[PDB]
Design a protein around this nucleic acid. Sequence first.
RNA 1: GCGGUAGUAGCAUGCUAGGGAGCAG
RNA 2: UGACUGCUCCCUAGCAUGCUACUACCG
Lengths: 193, 187, 200, 72
Amino acid sequence: KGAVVYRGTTTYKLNVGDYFVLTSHTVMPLSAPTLVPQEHYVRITGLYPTLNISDEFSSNVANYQKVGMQKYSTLQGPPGTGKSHFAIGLALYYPSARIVYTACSHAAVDALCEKALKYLPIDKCSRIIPAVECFDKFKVNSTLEQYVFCTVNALPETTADIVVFDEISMATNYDLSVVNARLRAKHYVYIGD
Amino acid sequence: FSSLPSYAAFATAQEAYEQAVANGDSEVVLKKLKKSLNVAKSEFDRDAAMQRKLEKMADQAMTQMYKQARSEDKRAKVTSAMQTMLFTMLRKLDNDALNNIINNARDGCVPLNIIPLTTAAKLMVVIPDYNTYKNTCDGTTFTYASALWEIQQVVDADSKIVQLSEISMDNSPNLAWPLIVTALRAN
Amino acid sequence: VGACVLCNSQTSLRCGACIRRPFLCCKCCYDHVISTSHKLVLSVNPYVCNAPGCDVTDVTQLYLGGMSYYCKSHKPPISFPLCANGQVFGLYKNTCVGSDNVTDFNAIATCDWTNAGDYILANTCTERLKLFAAETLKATEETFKLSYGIATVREVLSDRELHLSWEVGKPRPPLNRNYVFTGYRVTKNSKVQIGEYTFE
Amino acid sequence: KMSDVKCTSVVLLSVLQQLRVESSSKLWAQCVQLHNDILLAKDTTEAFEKMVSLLSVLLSMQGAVDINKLCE
RNA sequence: GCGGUAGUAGCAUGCUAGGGAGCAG
RNA sequence: UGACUGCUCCCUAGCAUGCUACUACCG
Ligand SMILES: [Zn+2]
Ligand SMILES: [Zn+2]
Ligand SMILES: [Zn+2]
């Protein structure tokens, strides 16, 4: 509501008899839990330690070290406290973990992609196009890729090591179960509060 | 069986029987005692005939329910298998020439016998003898079904790759003879 | 259908709840069933209630019925307990010898191969029992070493330097040459010739 | 005698089939022809010649130990 | 001392189910 | 990889019917 304003980037001409309905989906049974119980590790395992470390974010090295000790972790920060680029700088501090980005909204991925292309490489990153306005210059059907961008609605079965779920406030327990069932990893990272 | 009210009645009847046997009671008391135990046996006969029948009926119903659940599981498995078979055979259709011939139809309907004859990317020829081989699959490329086919592999009934140089008049009896030549569509 | 393990008697009964399914004659198989938790024994067909949707495996609860074995809740009126008269029903139920010495078998069958008592009993028993104990020890070792997942290596590093990880909660395997890894690498479909490696 | 040779042909083709002779299309076709002709034969001379021809197939392979099976 | 009615079990018949097998077109 | 139909035997299980068997209720 601004005779209704549409927040779409594309154009379309309607016709006679066309109607818009609040179309929902069929909620499949939820198998995967929200998160596995945590456990204190003795060493930094599950992620590959590289001999070269990143000095680009000196105030996040300790945070990454502490994340590497906990199974699933979440940092309590106000919006804009490195919330959009914490996982981005994590993917560059340790370029040896399968980093998977996911969000509860399809229109909120533009903020993620705004600086990801400047920080993470564009050639080695791609987005799978299902058969609403996103980049189409990427390469489709890239099952085996270090960095994967996709949405929970059309997320196939895959595995990773570090999964980051931005905007955790608007995601429900059903959304958490869907995230954990579509993508299976031993670590889960939640950004926000 | 072991928790019915008739058990206490039977115990009381046995206690009364023991008391009558020890004391030596009259015939009327013995008859009354028998009329109690014997019709408590009537009550327990029913508890061992209707309840035992209900237990058998419940077991039969549970068995039928197990069979129905297994049948539904088999239905789901067969449905998934058939759906996957259809979906994995549709993906090999090469829908380019398939749409080329379907859209060229009068109403999009074509006979089935022409779809492999027009839109199949691989041709398999089974040849019983060299006399039919030289006529049909001569050389490394041949024409059939108004199209040009180039051989990519020739095998015998033993499924052993046999080279084109081996298909000779004198070398024919040295090969298993239903020769299966597989060719690809030329363009 | 072969000679018994603990009694050297012809038998067609394999203790299903055991690891290597040893051949046991009727009397000794009954002794193993009643003196341990090995309530499952096999035959030409497994001893289990053949009525659909049943989940009883205990020979004590299993009764011979028609052309198959059933349980009290699923038995025909002509019912015949499998394990009775000190022997479980089966072939060679009459041409049987048995053995009073069944305590050692019942003790070794349920052992985790983590105590020195298992080694002492294996070294001090009958030859057939010693061979069975050795076979079950090897089976337990290969099932404990295969009780984990596939160690996945995602990066390649310089020579003689690999960061190999473990599973979630998996203890550290022996780093010496005690275990020689002999796998089979998969290119796309088939697992063949990973090579021979020796972790050090 | 004739029934004897036909039954020997049957068992010989059985052992040939058990030896993966059907993996060779020509050899299996020849064995099948010999076996069917022995069973359709009317005289114990043609049948015995075809029996020798069929047994040559078994003797031609190294999959069967001929000394061990001749226990007499 | 009575007809039992009933009942519930050895015995028989049949109907169904399940398994194994044989012949025929 | 193992078709459709028909007839016949054998074993087991449960259920309908003819008995047989005894205890006592009821007049
Ligand atoms: Zn024994
Ligand atoms: Zn056992
Ligand atoms: Zn049962």
